[PDB]
């Protein structure tokens, strides 16, 4: 039984684990703590890039954004290297997805604009996709830091799975913009040890990870079977029992994904 397996993983990793896989015509939804809130961490970058793509003509990707020393205040593997030249919106989208670049995410929030440095407009974008649960309240790095149980900067496995389903498999974006989002997630550099690790090599996986304080580790993915049948997989976790400095445990996500893959294979 899946729920027993997931509960065993929670005990193993001193963690809280949330899992959602939407139903298909032949598979029931998989749910474990699916409606409990967990911090987004960088998983929000996927719908953030969708929002920026949706909002603008595609040639907005070529607009140069300049930024300075006081803009680098979070892990930013790409933006730190390009601070002297600026980055285009397309480069920012690439970095935000593929490297979880926090400065890139903050600059994209600013590009979206409006109250809360773009966080209200981001939340509004999710509302437009029928998500009345998720909320973004802070930028990077603060959005990773809310205490366990705090609702700020949270989604749920169920909510984020349904959002990602619309973005990747549905019609939230026109095909040209959808392809940009999907390809950036396909070329992600941060997810090899999470959902990807739980699915056989002949399944395709595209994903966006998140990692935060209090042992937070997330991954949201779309996977395709070897015959092209897609599934959406959201796995979220935290480790409040270890306090603020608890390490994220990628292996919890890999094991959870292995259990999911066993059901879907
Ligand atoms: C196993 N796993 N999976 N996901 N997260 C983890 S471990 C959590 C984690 C730790 C930690 O110490 O344990 N960190 C560092 O150490 C910091 N390194 C950097 O800030 C920086 O060098 C960097 C950031 C990103 C890419 C390359 C370089 C960060 S990176 C996040
Ligand atoms: C997804 N991909 N990329 N490279 N190889 C693949 S798997 C082959 C494939 C499958 C399938 O059932 O094998 N598809 C879907 O599922 C249908 N749509 C989407 O995936 C779609 O919502 C989307 C359309 C346009 C741009 C981005 C996303 C098609 S797309 C072709
Ligand atoms: C309960 N127990 N007993 N023995 N092993 C365990 S649990 C295994 C384990 C976990 C874990 O994931 O569970 N860790 C963290 O999280 C990491 N802590 C830090 O990075 C940080 O707080 C720190 C870095 C340097 C000096 C002091 C603190 C390491 S500690 C090893
Ligand atoms: C790829 N890699 N390689 N080694 N470790 C990695 S992890 C990939 C990664 C992700 C992610 O998308 O999973 N991130 C976030 O989410 C952002 N979290 C924060 O900035 C954050 O404040 C924070 C960072 C670390 C510890 C506690 C809080 C960053 S951090 C880098
Ligand atoms: C670019 N790169 N190189 N290697 N991995 C990478 S990817 C980024 C990354 C870095 C880094 O260097 O940025 N890491 C550390 O530093 C390690 N942190 C720890 O193991 C950890 O917190 C710890 C636990 C217990 C005691 C002491 C330290 C890992 S975590 C992954």
Positive or negative: CA dihedral 142, 150, 215, 99: negative
CA of 166 to the centre of ligand 4 (A): 25
Contact predicate 153/138, CB 8 Å: yes
Dihedral Cα 105, 109, 111, 115, nearest 10 deg: -160
Contact predicate 191/207, CB 8 Å: yes
- Active-site option among 139, 140, 250, 255: 140
Tokens representing 167? 């973005």
* Cβ neighbours around 84 below 10 Å, total: 7
Q: Using CA positions, which residue lies closest to atom 2 of ligand 4?
A: 190
Tokens representing 63? 């607009």
Helix (H) or strand (E) holding 211: strand 204-212
Rounded Cα–Cα distance for residues 30 and 51 (Å): 28
Tokens representing 174? 């026109």
Tokens representing 4? 């027993």
Q: Which residues contact 229 (CB under 8 A, 6 or more apart)?
A: 24
Contact predicate 41/212, CB 8 Å: yes
Ranges assigned E (strand) in 79-197? 87-88, 154-155
Rounded Cα–Cα distance for residues 44 and 29 (Å): 23
Give the gyration radius of the chain's Cα atoms.
Answer: 17
Kindly give the number of the ligand 4 atom that is closest to the alpha carbon of 218. 13
* Cβ neighbours around 224 below 10 Å, total: 16
Angle between helices 175-186 and 45-55 (to 10 degrees): 150
Omega within 30 of 0 (cis) for the link into 141: yes
Positive or negative: CA dihedral 122, 218, 25, 206: positive
Find out whether the beta carbon of 142 lies less than 6 Å from any atom of ligand 1: no
Q: Residue 234: beta bridge partners?
A: 20, 220
Find out whether the beta carbon of 251 lies less than 6 Å from any atom of ligand 3: no
Rounded Cα–Cα distance for residues 127 and 131 (Å): 5
CA contacts within 13 A on the Cβ side of 34? 17
* Cβ neighbours around 51 below 10 Å, total: 26
Contact predicate 205/187, CB 8 Å: no
Q: Which structural technique was applied?
A: X-ray
Q: Which residues contact 227 (CB under 8 A, 6 or more apart)?
A: none
CA contacts within 13 A on the Cβ side of 127? 8
Contact predicate 231/168, CB 8 Å: no
Helix (H) or strand (E) holding 232: strand 230-238
Q: Relative to the alpha carbon of 190, which ligand is closest? A: 4
Three-state secondary structure call for residue 257: helix
First and final C-alpha spacing in the chain: 16
Which CATH number is associated with domain 1-265?
3.40.710.10
Rounded Cα–Cα distance for residues 187 and 200 (Å): 18
Contact predicate 250/193, CB 8 Å: yes
Tokens representing 61? 């990707």
Active site residue 134: no
Active site residue 250: no
Positive or negative: CA dihedral 119, 123, 124, 125: positive
Query: What residue segments make up the domains of the chain, in order of their start?
Result: 1-265
DSSP one-letter code for 233: E
**Is 100 annotated as a binding-site member?**
yes
Find out whether the beta carbon of 118 lies less than 6 Å from any atom of ligand 4: no
- Active-site option among 42, 76, 134, 237: 42
SS (H, E, C) 165-204: HHHHCCCCCCHHHHHHHHHHHHCCCCCCCCHHHHCCCCCE
Chain center to CA of 71? 22
Helix (H) or strand (E) holding 39: strand 38-39
Helix (H) or strand (E) holding 91: helix 89-98
Contact predicate 237/213, CB 8 Å: no
């Amino acid at each position: 039984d899946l729920a027993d397996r997931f509960a065993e993983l929670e005990r193993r990793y001193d963690a809280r684990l949330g899992v959602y896989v939407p139903a298909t015509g032949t598979t029931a939804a998989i749910e474990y703590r699916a409606d409990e809130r967990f911090a987004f961490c960088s998983t929000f970058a996927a719908p953030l890039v969708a929002a920026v793509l949706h909002q603008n003509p595609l040639t907005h990707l070529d607009k140069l954004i300049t930024y300075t020393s006081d803009d680098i205040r979070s892990i930013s593997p790409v933006a730190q290297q390009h601070v002297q030249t600026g980055m285009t919106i397309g480069q920012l989208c690439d970095a935000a997805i593929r490297y979880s670049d926090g400065t890139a995410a903050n600059l994209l929030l600013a590009d979206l604009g409006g109250p809360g440095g773009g966080t209200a407009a981001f939340t509004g974008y999710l509302r437009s996709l029928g998500d009345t649960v998720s909320r973004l309240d802070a930028e990077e790095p603060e959005l990773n830091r809310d205490p366990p149980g705090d609702e700020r900067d949270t989604t749920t496995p169920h909510a984020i799975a349904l959002v990602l389903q619309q973005l990747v498999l549905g019609n939230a974006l026109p095909p040209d913009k959808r392809a940009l989002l999907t390809d950036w997630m396909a070329r992600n550099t941060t997810g090899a040890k999470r959902i990807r690790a739980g699915f056989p090599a002949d399944w395709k996986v595209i994903d966006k990870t998140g990692t935060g304080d209090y042992g937070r580790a997330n991954d949201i993915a779309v996977v395709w079977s070897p015959t092209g049948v897609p599934y959406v997989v959201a796995v979220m976790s935290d480790r409040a029992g270890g306090g603020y400095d608890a390490e994220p445990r990628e292996a919890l996500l890999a094991e959870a994904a292995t259990c999911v893959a066993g059901v879907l294979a």
